[PDB]
Nucleic acid binder design. Structure first.
Ligand SMILES: [Mg+2]
Ligand SMILES: [Mg+2]
Ligand SMILES: [Mg+2]
Ligand SMILES: [Mg+2]
Ligand SMILES: [Mg+2]
Lengths: 191, 136, 290, 197, 171, 106
RNA sequence: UCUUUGCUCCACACAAUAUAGAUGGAUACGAAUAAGGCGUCCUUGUGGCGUCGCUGAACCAUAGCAGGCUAGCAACGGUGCACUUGGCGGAAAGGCCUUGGGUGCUUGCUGGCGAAUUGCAAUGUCAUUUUGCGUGGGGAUAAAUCAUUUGUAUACGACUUAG
């Protein structure tokens, strides 16, 4: 109904620095730097007290206002990922055929290589996105861990690795084999 | 270092906001937003200029950087008092916006003899300026 | 109503119009993509088809029934006397395509190649490149600045070569001349290679090697005006057909009230330019050799 | 008002610019449109791509070589939008379309010249914010235009040279405005301000 | 058109059986007196046994707003015929006069319900004299302390068709 | 000086017409700098000249002239109606014409 | 080039030819528009401070017989023409910048002489497009087609060859 003011607040922790020209955001923190482009959204930013940033929409409808809290969440997640980080743990599931997950370096691109998925002779290659770090977890059986600042990159890498291992021509209620995200959290949980 | 956010302030519609009227019977007079009726229209009053108290759409008006103190619903006498108190019209005449409006009006009111005089004077000023733009 | 029984179109529609080629020498409409790392080399060559003959060889195809067994195969022979490099020309990119800005030629053009610029050579003062050759003899003025222009510009470079037709048994005496792209790197190095090879010969051993796959681009054998049957492979109408059986019976429906372009019609067969790809080289043979 | 008017097509809506241009041409004005690859169309990219596929499907059936020709460059997409607004089967229409040129990018002479815009055809003024739009170069290269890259390279070159020109022009007008300010506070300048200059 | 408010007073025609009838009154929003008197009979035919032939009009008077410059909040009770059936509505309109409110109401109904003047009835228009009796958020939004808001994305209209600089949407 | 112009420039646009029928006895003129009839009123009654060239010299000149006058305003955007002694050829749609400042009422 | 002195470029001399339509100047950043331009400062950044916009209604140019003939003052500037130096520009560059002096004008200022009769207005003729004929100053000295012939071609044309 054309709300004339809607605002959301963005709290900024100690060591982080947020620089926002037109709608290009740059967050700088301990774990690194991130940057985003929001020129598709038509909102305005306002610094309050060096630890608070308001995001406002004027004379906006339901959709224009729904995008405001989205912007708020995106910048909050950039801050969270540059201070704490994001960590997605994935578990391998198999009944008979062991899935052999390795990392290879074709032309220095750092691909993930999945072998023997349901006895497949296909060698399935997932590229690692820049900003993501892979660790095969010792202290747990058949677990891989993708860590980085950008939750977008990390979760999309996880989705890629989970979707490359889909089963075809079978009942997926019985053939549950794959690589599934078990946990989504932070590198610095409960600091 | 610390956070920096380009503020991008722009001309809030608020009580006390001075607006220049753009089209209508006033058509160049100043008024003050006295109340806000909707997102698209406001109640104004410009008694020093002769603008009657009226509701008006914001497309008929141009907002200025000027702003003075008013309580909402203020009547024409209160507006006339606070206007002179805050010294609005001279603050407006001091702006280059108003100076440019006056330049336009004067250039229009010029006659042919004056148009001859200004070109003579412009040739003189050009001689001096182009002498100056050869030593530095 | 609908066709009683399905069958495919007789002929390929992407090989239309089945018309005579504009020239007897087919032109290369695409060269290999350039890697600006490898040395400077030609991407193509000019030769004359001599004939076909028979080859025996031991096949190496693990999984076949004829692995490590002798097979008989047909080959075609192309007489490839060395080409002679006379000229280069630079092409620069524009929003309307690649455009040539300059063509630099060699100082001395041979008779067999300057016969390509005449339709009546027996009655001529022969007066060809007689001022361009005097453009030399002042050290490099009108030539080196053209080459520098090609260097400063010209994302693409092509060398003009001609055939040594007099070395063949053909009685034509008129050399074929063609543009051949260079696919090395450093356009400066491309054009310096060209300048060094001006008036000089380039052999097929420097361009092609054995077991290499190549494309053959040629105008195909002409057969004149041919009927729809052999031109398109349509069905012969039965014996008791009035006014001819070697025809297409229906050439269209009532509506659209027109003959469609996709309907088989009589016309020229042969003398089309064709590109045939993936022909393996089985031998590159020298003529200074019994 | 000017002999020939150069319009920078960047930021403009295709149909609105075309309707302005067609009327200007018929009223006798010579026009040249540059940077047609950066023209904007209202509606999302898929929505306009489907519209172009629908027009691409349309062809003379007994011979496609004589049908509605589907020109793929942005300049010709604009020309198509525009001669539908001109009565091009008349000599008047022919003359008007001869008073028009359309170019991808800003080639020579028109690069050393002044460009103008049409505010009643500009996207930022005419479309609500939030309403999606597509870019003509992207559409064109999607439907078969081949030269989206070379124009970008040449335009980068053009912009480098143009910025090197604007630096000099700026530095010179600063000397000019300083000399004029010093020549102010003068009898002549005051007598001119009395008259509005 | 642009509306006006009319006090219309009417009276069944006198007889020997009953002189001095009961002098009914109505407030009518209309562009002129002819339409005002038409609607008076339209409604009085719905309420009472009378028509323009068996009745008369004793006085029609234009009512002007007593305070045309105070910004009022109105509530309007509307009956309107849809395509399927008939419905009732309560709508809150923030405006400076009853006639302006009724204009805005006819436009909002034409826009949001495709209802036409012939389909709309006005039951009453009432000034909400106490804030917090307002119940519609789209009016309650402009009843906030020291309210202020900008107008982003200004569009300046050009007298010419060619501009020699790129415009700006600053404000 | 460099400028010797004592006329306002204009363009012949069209004939008085409906969607499908024209009247060559009335022409439409666009005057530069005019964008409303209240400003186009200054030009009513003023003389108009269409000046054209020919290859033949008739009476000392290869330049021939059609004279007309502004009659009334057309529309809301400063276009005027003009009437010429002999109507305009209709190849002059888009052609330049001269509106003189006489007969003056200043 | 001796189809009887032809072809081409330049200069000016005259004729014809027409004009989709001059009549002071097409006056050059780029990007964004819920943001920018310009100045200035610094620790040179997504920086601070100030200012502008709200239209080109601007900027520049513009006075002189359709722009005459002359005298002087003040400054060493402005502008045009032809030369000249060095660059840059290939997207359709065919234009942009610059050096040096020569020459003319200068309305920056002050003066003198002249205009009339086109008769109360008549576009009151000032532009560019091509072509041709002349003079005078340079510059260069071919091909194609038919016919014959060939068969990598072919109904005929055409194509490919040779002489
Ligand atoms: Mg079927
Ligand atoms: Mg059938
Ligand atoms: Mg076959
Ligand atoms: Mg029979
Ligand atoms: Mg294609």
């Amino acid at each position: 109904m054309k709300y004339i003011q809607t605002e959301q607040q963005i709290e900024v922790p100690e060591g982080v620095t947020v620089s926002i020209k037109s709608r290009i955001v740059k967050v700088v923190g301990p774990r690194g730097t991130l940057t985003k482009n929001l020129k598709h959204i038509d909102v305005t930013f306002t610094k309050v007290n060096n630890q608070l940033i308001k995001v406002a929409v004027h004379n906006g409808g339901r959709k224009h206002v729904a995008a405001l809290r989205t912007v708020k969440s995106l910048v909050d997640n950039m801050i969270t990922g540059v201070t704490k980080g994001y960590k997605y743990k994935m578990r391998y599931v198999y009944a008979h055929f062991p899935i052999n997950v390795n990392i290879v370096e074709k032309d220095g691109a750092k691909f993930i290589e999945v072998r023997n998925f349901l006895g497949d002779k296909k060698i399935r290659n997932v590229p690692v996105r820049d900003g993501v770090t892979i660790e095969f977890s010792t202290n747990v059986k058949d677990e891989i861990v993708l860590s980085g600042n950008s939750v977008e990159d990390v979760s999309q890498n996880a989705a890629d690795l989970q979707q490359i291992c889909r089963v075809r021509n079978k009942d997926i209620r019985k053939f549950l084999d794959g690589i599934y995200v078990s946990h989504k959290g932070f590198i610095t949980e409960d600091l | 270092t610390d956070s920096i956010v380009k503020a991008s302030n722009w001309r809030l519609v608020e009580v006390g906001r001075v607006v220049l009227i753009k089209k209508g019977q006033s058509a160049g007079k100043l008024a003050a937003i006295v109340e806000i009726i909707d997102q698209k229209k406001v109640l104004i009053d410009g008694p020093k200029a002769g603008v009657p108290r009226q509701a008006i759409n914001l497309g008929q008006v141009v907002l200025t950087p000027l702003t003075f103190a008013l309580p909402r619903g203020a009547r024409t006498a209160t507006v006339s008092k606070k206007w002179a108190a805050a010294a609005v019209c001279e603050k407006w005449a001091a702006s280059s916006w108003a100076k440019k409006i006056a330049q336009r009006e004067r250039r229009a009111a010029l006659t042919d003899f004056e148009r001859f005089q200004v070109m003579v004077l412009r040739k003189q000023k050009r001689y001096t300026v182009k002498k100056a733009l050869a030593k530095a | 109503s609908h066709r009683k029984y399905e069958a495919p179109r007789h002929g390929h529609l992407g090989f239309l119009p089945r018309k005579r080629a504009a020239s007897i020498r087919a032109r290369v409409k695409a060269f290999p993509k350039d890697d600006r790392s490898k040395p400077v080399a030609l991407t193509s060559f000019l030769g004359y088809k001599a004939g076909m003959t028979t080859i025996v060889r031991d096949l190496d195809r693990p999984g076949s029934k004829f692995h490590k067994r002798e097979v008989v195969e047909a080959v075609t022979v192309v007489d490839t006397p060395p080409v002679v490099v006379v000229g280069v020309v630079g092409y620069v990119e524009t929003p309307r395509g690649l455009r040539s800005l300059t063509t630099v030629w060699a100082e001395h053009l041979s008779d067999e190649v300057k016969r390509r610029f005449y339709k009546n050579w027996y009655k001529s003062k022969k007066k060809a490149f007689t001022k361009y050759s005097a453009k030399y003899a002042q050290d490099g003025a009108g030539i080196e600045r053209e080459l520098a222009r090609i260097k400063k510009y010209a994302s693409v470079v092509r060398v003009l070569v001609h055939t040594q037709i007099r070395k063949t048994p053909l009685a034509q005496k008129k050399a074929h001349l063609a543009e051949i792209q260079l696919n090395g790197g450093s356009i400066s190095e491309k054009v310096d290679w060209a300048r060094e090879h001006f008036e000089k010969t380039v052999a097929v051993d420097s361009v092609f090697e054995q077991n290499e796959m190549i494309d053959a681009i040629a105008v195909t054998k002409g057969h004149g005006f041919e009927g729809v049957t052999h031109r398109w492979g349509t069905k012969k109408l039965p014996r008791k057909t009035h006014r001819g059986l070697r025809k297409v019976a229906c050439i269209g429906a009532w509506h659209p009230a027109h003959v469609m372009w996709s309907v088989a019609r009589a016309g020229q067969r042969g003398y089309h330019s064709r590109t045939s790809i993936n022909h393996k080289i089985y031998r590159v043979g020298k003529g200074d050799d019994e | 008002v000017e002999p020939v008017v150069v319009i920078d097509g960047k930021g403009h809506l295709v149909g609105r610019l075309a309707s302005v241009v067609a009327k200007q041409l018929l009223n006798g004005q010579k026009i040249v449109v540059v940077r047609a690859e950066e023209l904007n169309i209202s509606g999302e990219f898929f929505r306009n791509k489907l519209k172009y596929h629908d027009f691409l499907r349309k062809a003379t059936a007994f011979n496609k070589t004589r049908g509605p020709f589907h020109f793929r460059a942005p300049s010709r997409i604009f020309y198509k939008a525009l001669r539908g607004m001109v009565s091009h089967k008349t000599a008047r229409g022919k003359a008007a379309l001869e008073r028009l040129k359309v170019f991808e990018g800003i080639p020579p002479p028109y690069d050393k010249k002044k460009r103008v815009v049409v505010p009643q055809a500009l996207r930022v003024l005419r479309l609500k914010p939030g309403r999606k739009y597509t870019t003509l170069g992207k559409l064109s290269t999607s439907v078969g235009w081949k030269y989206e890259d070379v124009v970008a390279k040449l335009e980068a070159k053009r912009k480098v040279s143009s910025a090197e020109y604007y630096a000099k022009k700026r530095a010179f007008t600063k000397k000019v405005a300083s000399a004029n300010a010093t020549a102010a506070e003068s009898d002549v300048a005051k007598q001119l301000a009395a008259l509005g200059y | 058109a642009h509306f006006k408010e009319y006090q219309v007073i009417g009276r069944r025609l006198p007889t020997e059986s009953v002189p001095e009838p009961k002098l009914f009154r109505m407030r009518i929003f209309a562009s002129n007196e002819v339409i005002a008197k038409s609607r008076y009979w339209y409604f009085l035919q719905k309420l009472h046994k009378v028509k323009k032939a068996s009745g008369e009009i004793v006085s029609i008077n234009q009512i002007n707003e007593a305070h045309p410059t105070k910004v009022k909040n109105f509530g309007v009770w509307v009956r309107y015929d849809s395509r399927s059936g008939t419905h009732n509505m309560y709508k809150e309109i923030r405006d400076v006069s009853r006639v302006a409110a009724v204009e805005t109401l006819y436009q909002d109904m034409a826009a949001r319900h495709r209802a036409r003047f012939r389909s709309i009835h006005i039951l009453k228009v009432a000034e909400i004299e106490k804030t917090a009796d307002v119940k519609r958020q789209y009016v309650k939004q402009f009843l906030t302390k020291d309210l202020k808001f900008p107008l982003p994305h200004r569009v300046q209209k050009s007298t010419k068709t060619f501009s020699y600089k790129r415009p700006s949407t600053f404000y | 000086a460099e400028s010797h112009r004592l006329y306002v420039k204009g363009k012949h646009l069209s004939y008085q017409r409906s969607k499908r029928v024209n009247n060559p006895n009335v022409s439409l003129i666009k005057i530069e700098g005019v964008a409303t009839p209240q400003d186009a009123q200054f030009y009513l009654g003023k003389r108009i000249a269409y000046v054209y060239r020919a290859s033949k010299e008739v009476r000392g000149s290869k330049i021939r002239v059609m004279w007309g006058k502004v009659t009334r305003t057309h529309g809301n955007s400063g276009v005027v109606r003009a009437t010429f002694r002999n109507n305009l050829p209709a190849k002059t749609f888009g052609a330049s014409v001269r509106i003189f400042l006489y007969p003056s009422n200043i």
